[PDB]
Symmetry: D2
Subunit: 499 residues, 4 copies
């Protein structure tokens, strides 16, 4: 007949067949007698407050919407599991990696970045790749993207960055004067602004892009020896991007392209999968290493720090109810079980607060209690109580202060975080100059092929062409600071567009 997604209701009925339908009730469970005609005095008379059937349904409809994610509003999500296939026990003591074959339930959400909830899937914009691992040591959230780097390296620049990528404060339209102005004055974005305008910019679905932990992290073993690393999970279905035009029509053809693709895939037994890897770098290595190992606009090279195989990510389940299971999904980079710890990454360090914070605003103080966010394969026992919309039993009559002498939750010395020594004055160290070009250049020439090199410049100019001339010059100046031909090639394009 037609695709699985299209036949959503058709199947819901079929399976629910040979069953008397449920009795329509109110929020409180009172059976409604008639829900098609309001209660009025006389056929042409006014509506009566007496109609609580009405107010019940209407009041709830009046509140359906919650704020969309400040970033990554438009996204898709599914569920699967993570299977350890290799032993990195010597790096992490994290139960998630315990043994070979250790299955741990996961939840994933894919998303775009700037576009609101109604935007279209297939547009130039990075791709969010969130992974929630429901482990025995609580949940671990690997909040990644389909790229290993990022436009900036200091939290303070983030809000501002995002603004430029979004709408104008007054006209409310997308504004290139803000886009490029920000990028012009901020040349560190060069590495990412390239990757973005490259083929990878617009992936053909969520299944044909790679996952990247992006930031540098820390791994701890059962013997307290820590080491840094990067997370990588390559697509088993391979990298397949969309053409600028192909995606262009799809854009208005099917703005939910990603959604559709991901659904039917899993809906037909054709579950996608990713292979998780890790680059490991010692504290000595990070010591000698040659730009800041925590710079988010830089990447460790496979050459020196090679990719190690860790396990498999398999998505074999679709959300039953999208709002409840995907939209309400909350991923906190701060959720890191023992064996995994943050790293000095200024950027990351900031995310440590932003994410749980906004979640309390977007979803509510007790969000970790929403089914899909709850650490259910673990046991939440603590001294936190109440808060609005408190689910469960608020931990019943348990003593609510630590320490105590009434057998309340004890602590785990084992779970103590690895300690690192840090010297140096406490202040705001400038990081606007850490080489916003070396790595970039290598991508252009080394990583990029003559063919992509063309479309990149072309793609950039295609957009930059709408910005003030003075902004254009700045942008070209940085690209040429990456390599004469880069900017030169771009610049050439610019002049034509400028009629």
């Amino acid at each position: 007949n037609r695709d699985p997604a299209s036949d959503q209701m058709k199947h819901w009925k079929e399976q629910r067949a040979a069953q008397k339908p449920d009795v329509l009730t109110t929020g409180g469970g009172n059976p409604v007698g008639d829900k098609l005609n309001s209660l009025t005095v006389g056929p042409r008379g006014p509506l009566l407050v007496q109609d609580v059937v009405f107010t019940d349904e209407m009041a709830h409809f009046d509140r359906e919407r919650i704020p969309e994610r400040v970033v990554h509003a438009k996204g898709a999500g599914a569920f699967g599991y993570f299977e350890v296939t290799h032993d990195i026990t010597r790096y992490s003591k994290a139960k998630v990696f315990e043994h070979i074959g250790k299955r741990t339930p996961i939840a994933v959400r894919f998303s775009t970045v700037a576009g609101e909830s109604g935007s279209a899937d297939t547009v130039r914009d990075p791709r969010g790749f969130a992974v929630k691992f429901y482990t025995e040591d609580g949940n671990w959230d690997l909040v990644g993207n389909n790229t290993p780097i990022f436009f900036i390296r200091d939290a303070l620049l983030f809000p501002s960055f995002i603004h430029s990528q979004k709408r104008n404060p007054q006209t409310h339209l997308k504004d290139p004067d803000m886009v490029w102005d920000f990028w012009s004055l901020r040349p560190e974005s060069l590495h990412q602004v390239s990757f973005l305008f490259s083929d990878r910019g617009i992936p053909d679905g969520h299944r044909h892009m790679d996952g990247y932990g992006s930031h540098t992290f820390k791994l701890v073993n059962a013997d307290g020896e820590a080491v840094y690393c990067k997370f990588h999970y390559k697509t088993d279905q391979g990298i397949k991007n969309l053409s600028v035009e192909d995606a262009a029509r799809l854009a208005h053809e099917d703005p939910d392209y990603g959604l559709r693709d991901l659904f039917n895939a899993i809906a037909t037994g054709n579950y996608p999968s990713w292979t998780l890897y890790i680059q490991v770098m010692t504290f000595s290595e990070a010591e000698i290493f040659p730009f800041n190992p925590f710079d988010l606009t830089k990447v460790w090279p496979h050459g020196d720090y090679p990719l190690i195989p860790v396990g498999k990510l398999v998505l074999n389940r679709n959300p039953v109810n999208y709002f409840a299971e995907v939209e309400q999904l909350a991923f906190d980079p701060s959720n890191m079980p023992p064996g995994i710890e943050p790293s000095p990454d200024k950027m990351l360090q900031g995310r440590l607060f932003a994410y749980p914070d906004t979640h309390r605003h977007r979803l509510g103080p007790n969000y970790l209690q929403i089914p899909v966010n709850c650490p259910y394969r673990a046991r939440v026992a603590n001294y936190q109580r109440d808060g609005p919309m408190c689910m469960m039993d608020n931990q019943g009559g348990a003593p609510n202060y630590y320490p105590n002498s009434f057998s309340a939750p004890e602590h785990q010395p084992s779970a103590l975080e690895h300690r690192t020594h840090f010297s140096g004055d406490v202040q705001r160290f400038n990081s606007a100059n850490d080489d916003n070009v070396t790595q970039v250049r290598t991508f252009y020439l080394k990583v990029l092929n003559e063919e992509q090199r063309k479309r990149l410049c072309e793609n950039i100019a295609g957009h930059l062409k709408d910005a003030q001339l003075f902004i254009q010059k700045k942008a070209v100046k940085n690209f040429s600071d990456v390599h004469p031909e880069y900017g030169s090639r771009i610049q050439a394009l610019l002049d034509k567009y400028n009629e």
Copy 2:
């Protein structure tokens, strides 16, 4: 050992005797290494945002508080059950009356009216007595008080009334001028005021007071035949109240005297109970009734409208977590299942709206999903979706539109509300002068004895003495209207009080 309440943690410990303490975790389930020392750079250095354990717990502590009920803030509740003892099935077709011996789970919340959450229990004030029955046809909330009447008879004066009863908008102090200016200008209150300042104004705990539906309601039987009613549930523990003396002592020695008392009684198997009677007035009798039958400031004389036994209200279970099960608790008079409906009572009418409304705010849009509020004994099936803090499965992938041809929930025609006829101009009818003295006079002369009339005027005068002279004149005048003696007895006391 002390009273059961005092030993709350002692028994908790004991409870899980040999059992080992759970692991202290973060909201995310991640186990904690050391919850007593914040992660700082150096033994005397600054704090690290990197300390997520702190931030996790702190941010939560920071949101523990929810708005306290706008009125009836300070309360104490419990759980138990309701058992049928008489066949009143000829009047109501409600399932909760389905058959002699039938038991239905219930939850009850007692309370004062004006005081905020910190306020004392043993103060002159009506007492809230709210019952929630988790019946097959959804939850039925009978939101009564300890008095069968009320100060006003039109919902538009409610906020006004409640305002006067609370603190001064500027000084934030209780304003006797406010209190009596209101009552002085709206004599409909006389009745309730007289009941209030009588011995019943300060019951001895919650176990020694009657519960009243107050408002008239409509009962509909299986034949669609309807009748009006009045709910009454008398204390089997006997009526008992506190003198203005002990009460003032208890107010500073034990502001939670009602809480503690109710907890202990239940804890020690001394289960309190109320007998539920009802009054029945036929539509024909409501026509020739000497007063407005839906006037909240009036009562149906036992003489012509005798009480009829229904069943018992038993409370044999304390809340395990007060917040989760008592604070979050929400009663909606609008929650009436098939066989039980509202009357035109102007006051009742305004309530059908306000309670659920204020719940969407105090607790949140999905407060009906909070455990204690969910009609777990019924199967909520409707076309309502999403909203913040959406739990359960959001009814999954079921067809979210009605009507539909996909087997989603269907309306039940046998739950259609009994239809009554009303004819008149749609306007703002004035009920201010609907006789605010008769019934009052009866209470003064017949229901009370001389010993009581004396305590009533003393009690009335006590507070009233503080209102401006002009406000006292007016108020005394209002009493003299009920009975010459009534006014002079108060005026005599005033004259005294005023040096």
Copy 3:
């Protein structure tokens, strides 16, 4: 040089003369010495909670988003004024229609319906034309669409309907089966459906479309005489639609097409305007009307009820800050001053409640306190106090109960609602069969020309084609009932579309 729109900031920097820039501060006002480099311990150390500059800005960032409109999420807004051209005081004594020359300021917002914040303008959907009149008797919100009718006439089906027009509960994709299964079971939509898929289905910007209050309202002169009316505000920029083609092209080429068209329109001093009329109808005629004068799915033929010009609607200022002034707007149908009242129109009745409701949730309980929403040309004084985010002086130390003896706000008996008589039973009367064709038929073969009659039948089949066959028939059936050649034309298309 570019358009006024793209030069938004451009002009801002210019007009900002040469005066220095304000000092970047925190919410508290403390000046920032460095907001580009987070406070860290060492040039490669962790982040300090002590960076309240960071925390302060990130925190705010995490909360910029608020729930979008349940419906009509996507739209534009501009301000201007209204002015009387004709005298209709013999009809309504509204303080806005006073005398000719009366210039009441206004606020307006155009928008689609189903599409979310990210959605695009250029697509088939009715348009929202809501006008806010800041009068002397409070604000008057004429919440209207680009059509005099609507798909349904009972509030109880609005949510359901608004569901069918949005995303599947599971897939989160638009769903034809939903769209058409709903319309199919409810032929009352016929009328408004016909328009949607008609040329008018896609206006060329907001300026080239007509505004309608849709519903039937009530006017009352200073003499107490009432009369039913219908509002019609025709565009002075002339009507104009967009080919299915262009609409789609624009859709993706410039999703926010309508947004800027409007902006530049005003920027380039070419302010848009509409002419306000009204269809008057005595109660006499209403009692005789061939249909229900309050049926939202019906119109009043112009020949029997001609348009009376009343005034000019001019928009000449663009929002300075989109969020604050447009996204934050609140239009409350219930906001009608003395002289203008609602009709028993079952849909209007429901809107009386719902709109203010959602506002309390989307914006906050004190939203009327938001600058844009505040009725600044009226003296808002009453007995309402407090609430979250209580701005203003919360009315100082003014008496907070009515009635009072301290000169607090008194009521104006000269603004009482107009008295009407309603005799009849209080029930849920079925309006499902209130004729869903007649007026529709005359729209087909009469209002539309064969040329555009076909373009209509095409537009429909292109969508109805995606629904299950069992759905398609029931769909045609209804159309057929309006006129065989109608459903036949469509059916034809389907069969071919159906390979």
Copy 4:
């Protein structure tokens, strides 16, 4: 007549003068023609949804309450000023000390700690003394108590501490077991516990107590030279405390005693006052100091650190509207203007985050926009936009990103954080046993005289006696450690108390 606080309305009216009562309007500005009777079909019929005057009013009342402060919920406020009586400029460059004589508008809130909104003032509890300086460098919030020390030196224990001090999670009653089990397990609380159970545990009104900054702060002059300090604002009204009998009496006689005492003292022109001092200490002295100078549980001996007079603190204005100006007051310790900086005080460190974090939930994301909270003396100009309930213009269309090329809010090197240096293995350093006896010892024998010691112990023994024998044992032990007698005395009373 009666007191000024009691004549609140009497005066408001006369001031209102022979003026005429404003017209009673809805929240929308529409005049109400009668806000005393509801719109009903017939004088004894149903209420109509159409009564938007009702719902407009009703709905506000239902949303009047916001979450009470999680701690220090019960309090009173007042505005006034701060005058520079001296030159401290040689230490701190805060413009609030610019020149002797310069005035700085201030706001102050006094409060208890444990008790909720409706509790009594005259109870044993530390006292809150928050001062909000409205300077031209933003707002400076000095959130201090009436004690210079506290029960704990690590934020991580604050939530737990406050929990033990409030109600039992299940019975909702005060729990001596939670109170003492905690304190007993944390001797570091011995200092403040001593101070708390002494004559200072209940000050007679707010005007008769001292204000302390508690935490060690930081002052930076013009040469970028810093200094640690302790703020002190001694009372000019003199130290006056209440006796257990009088405080316990005033508990019921007048639970708002402190609130009324202050309103009147200010209403009759008897303005309270406080001199401000600071204890300056070098980084070399702090190095030498025989204790952790940032340990919140200790004082800087006057001998070594004499107090220096800075300026004055006068409260000469009562809040017009208590809720809007007091209840909503929000003091964030992080609001320190250039010149004042925090200290490594582990405790203070946590406060930097907490207060503003909790304000986001109690008041709202945009709280700093509330009048009483707005830094009206400074000029808020930055790149933070939107957020729920956006007042003002939202910085209009000015650029929202930083940096930019359109002359938007610039930096301010002058206002940068003074840099300090720290070293050590970033970790969770155990502060549990940093000597919790020494300073208490002196307090006990030197600060207190025999009659006081006698009292201090009876005040303790009387409350401690209600905790289980084992806690008492543990508790006594901690007291003896400070001093053998401190232990035996309290112990002595207990045995008697245990009858």
